[PDB]
Design an enzyme around this catalytic site. Structure first.
Site, short mmCIF file in Angstrom:
data_model
loop_
_atom_site.label_atom_id
_atom_site.label_comp_id
_atom_site.label_asym_id
_atom_site.label_seq_id
_atom_site.Cartn_x
_atom_site.Cartn_y
_atom_site.Cartn_z
CD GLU A 24 -3.05 -1.11 2.16
OE1 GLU A 24 -3.01 -0.24 3.06
OE2 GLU A 24 -3.96 -1.97 2.10
CD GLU A 32 -4.50 -8.13 1.18
OE1 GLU A 32 -5.44 -7.49 1.72
OE2 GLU A 32 -3.30 -7.81 1.34
O1 LIG Z 1 -7.92 -9.00 10.66
C1 LIG Z 1 -7.75 -7.84 9.86
C2 LIG Z 1 -7.05 -8.21 8.55
O2 LIG Z 1 -7.83 -9.11 7.78
C3 LIG Z 1 -6.73 -6.97 7.73
O3 LIG Z 1 -5.97 -7.46 6.69
C4 LIG Z 1 -5.64 -6.33 5.88
C5 LIG Z 1 -6.85 -5.87 5.10
O4 LIG Z 1 -6.53 -4.73 4.29
C6 LIG Z 1 -5.51 -5.02 3.33
O5 LIG Z 1 -5.31 -3.89 2.56
C7 LIG Z 1 -4.22 -5.48 4.03
O6 LIG Z 1 -3.17 -5.76 3.10
C8 LIG Z 1 -4.52 -6.69 4.91
O7 LIG Z 1 -3.36 -7.08 5.64
O8 LIG Z 1 -5.94 -6.08 8.51
C9 LIG Z 1 -6.63 -5.63 9.67
C10 LIG Z 1 -6.94 -6.78 10.60
O9 LIG Z 1 -7.69 -6.30 11.73
O1 LIG Z 2 -7.00 0.70 4.81
C1 LIG Z 2 -7.32 0.15 3.54
C2 LIG Z 2 -8.71 0.59 3.09
O2 LIG Z 2 -8.79 2.01 2.94
C3 LIG Z 2 -9.10 -0.09 1.79
O3 LIG Z 2 -10.32 0.50 1.63
C4 LIG Z 2 -10.57 0.77 0.25
C5 LIG Z 2 -10.62 2.27 0.04
O4 LIG Z 2 -10.92 2.58 -1.33
C6 LIG Z 2 -12.20 2.08 -1.72
O5 LIG Z 2 -12.50 2.41 -3.04
C7 LIG Z 2 -12.27 0.57 -1.56
O6 LIG Z 2 -13.58 0.11 -1.89
C8 LIG Z 2 -11.90 0.15 -0.15
O7 LIG Z 2 -11.84 -1.27 -0.05
O8 LIG Z 2 -9.01 -1.51 1.91
C9 LIG Z 2 -7.68 -1.94 2.24
C10 LIG Z 2 -7.25 -1.37 3.58
O9 LIG Z 2 -5.93 -1.81 3.89
#
Ligand SMILES: O[C@@H]1[C@@H](O)[C@H](O[C@@H]2CO[C@@H](O)[C@H](O)[C@H]2O)OC[C@H]1O
Ligand SMILES: O[C@@H]1[C@@H](O)[C@H](O[C@@H]2CO[C@@H](O)[C@H](O)[C@H]2O)OC[C@H]1O
Ligand SMILES: [Ca+2]
Ligand SMILES: [Ca+2]
Ligand SMILES: [Ca+2]
Ligand SMILES: [Ca+2]
Ligand SMILES: [Ca+2]
Length: 358
Positions: free
Chosen positions: A149, A255
């Protein structure tokens, strides 16, 4: 009534000539029905949380290996490929990384010479974190999420503490260090979400192209693929994969989950029995199109991992609750909360030869 997941043909076997099929797991899921489902349908694993920087080194020199080790041992015993998630991230990263040896926050430092020393200290701390982790797991990990990210949704690089203190150098040094200790055999990925959004796809492409041109060892792009029933388009997903293949990079879907809702997930259902059948049908139609696209691009995709096993465990539940006053569930997989197959399972296990698209 649908059959249980352990009663149906294996997803991984269905795609074995095309790409890995993986799941994100917690160590407590490595028993019972969840383990049975894992061993039957998947040939790749990733740690949902146990290998993140704060999980592994929550305080400096405090190494918390137990949960990650149990996932590695499960992968060894059942001969599963293993992705490592993740070496460098701005979230679930311990704050001690960004505190200088006087106890001051590096991001607050105004003296230019001290900022340059802070940069060296942070990079050296990151190098040692990577070195220690890679040296322990190098023989068990196939694919590494080296950085996660790093691109901002608003354009440009994400201005996390990593970027504020080191610029882009944390990215170059992280890949260089992962390659140094993992060897040429290690497959190194930059991982991100919304890689289908053209403006973000283009930012990531331009960053990766520039780094490749400087000799940074990047082997592929991880597409988190946190998607929805109505978004993003198959067409934009195809364009993203093809743009990174044009740089010689591998693509992994890292993911995958398909939420029932939009973003944010307001108006979520609070019980699985409230979900209308026609929503699960819309989800099945979309998974069908998605996996046909993956099949079309199978030469360019090495692995597709779901961010969970069945609907009873998904971070999308927490997202629903965050946006619905503490209550709500989501149902994003092909296996439902009781481990029964959903319409989507049947629509990605079948075999179609003529792939239609726009
Ligand atoms: O249990 C939760 C996780 O499933 C979550 O995993 C993250 C989700 O957002 C992605 O963009 C990340 O790469 C991924 O690690 O993180 C938060 C945790 O509470
Ligand atoms: O923290 C991250 C989130 O911000 C992310 O959320 C995404 C934000 O942009 C939207 O357009 C998407 O729908 C939404 O999933 O997910 C990953 C997490 O690591
Ligand atoms: Ca593989
Ligand atoms: Ca079809
Ligand atoms: Ca492939
Ligand atoms: Ca759920
Ligand atoms: Ca299908």
């Amino acid at each position: 009534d649908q059959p249980f997941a352990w009663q149906v043909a294996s997803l991984s076997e269905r795609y074995q000539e095309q790409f890995d099929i993986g799941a994100a797991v917690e160590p407590y899921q490595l028993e019972g029905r969840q383990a049975q489902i894992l061993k039957h349908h998947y040939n790749s694993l990733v740690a949902e949380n146990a290998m993140k920087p704060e999980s592994l080194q929550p305080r400096e020199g405090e190494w918390n290996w137990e949960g990650a080790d149990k996932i590695v041992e499960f992968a060894r015993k059942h001969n599963m490929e293993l992705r490592f998630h993740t070496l460098v991230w701005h979230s679930q990263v311990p704050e001690w990384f960004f505190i200088d040896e006087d106890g001051n926050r590096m991001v607050d430092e105004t003296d230019p010479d001290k900022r340059e020393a802070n940069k060296q200290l942070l990079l050296e701390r990151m190098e040692n974190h990577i070195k220690t982790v890679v040296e322990r797991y190098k023989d068990d990990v196939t694919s590494w999420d080296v950085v996660n990210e790093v691109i901002d949704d608003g354009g440009g690089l994400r201005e996390s503490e990593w970027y504020q203190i080191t610029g882009t150098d944390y990215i170059k040094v992280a890949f260089e260090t992962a390659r140094k200790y993992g060897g040429e055999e290690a497959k190194l990925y930059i991982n991100d979400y919304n890689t289908e959004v053209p403006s973000k796809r283009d930012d990531l492409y331009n960053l990766v192209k520039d780094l490749l041109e400087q000799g940074v060892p990047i082997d592929g792009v991880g597409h988190q693929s946190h998607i929805q029933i109505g978004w993003p388009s198959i067409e934009d997903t195809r364009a993203s994969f093809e743009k990174f293949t044009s740089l010689g990079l591998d693509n992994q879907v890292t993911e995958l989950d398909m939420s029932l809702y939009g973003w944010p997930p307001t108006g979520a259902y609070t019980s699985y029995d409230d979900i209308p059948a026609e929503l699960l049908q819309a989800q099945a139609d979309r998974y069908d199109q998605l996996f046909e696209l993956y099949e079309e691009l199978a030469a360019d995709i090495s692995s597709v991992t779901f961010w969970g096993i069945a609907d009873n465990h998904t971070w999308l539940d927490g997202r629903a609750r965050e946006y619905n006053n503490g209550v709500g569930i989501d149902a994003p997989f092909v296996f439902d909360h009781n481990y029964r197959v959903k319409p989507a399972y049947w629509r990605i296990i079948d075999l179609e030869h003529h792939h239609h698209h726009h």
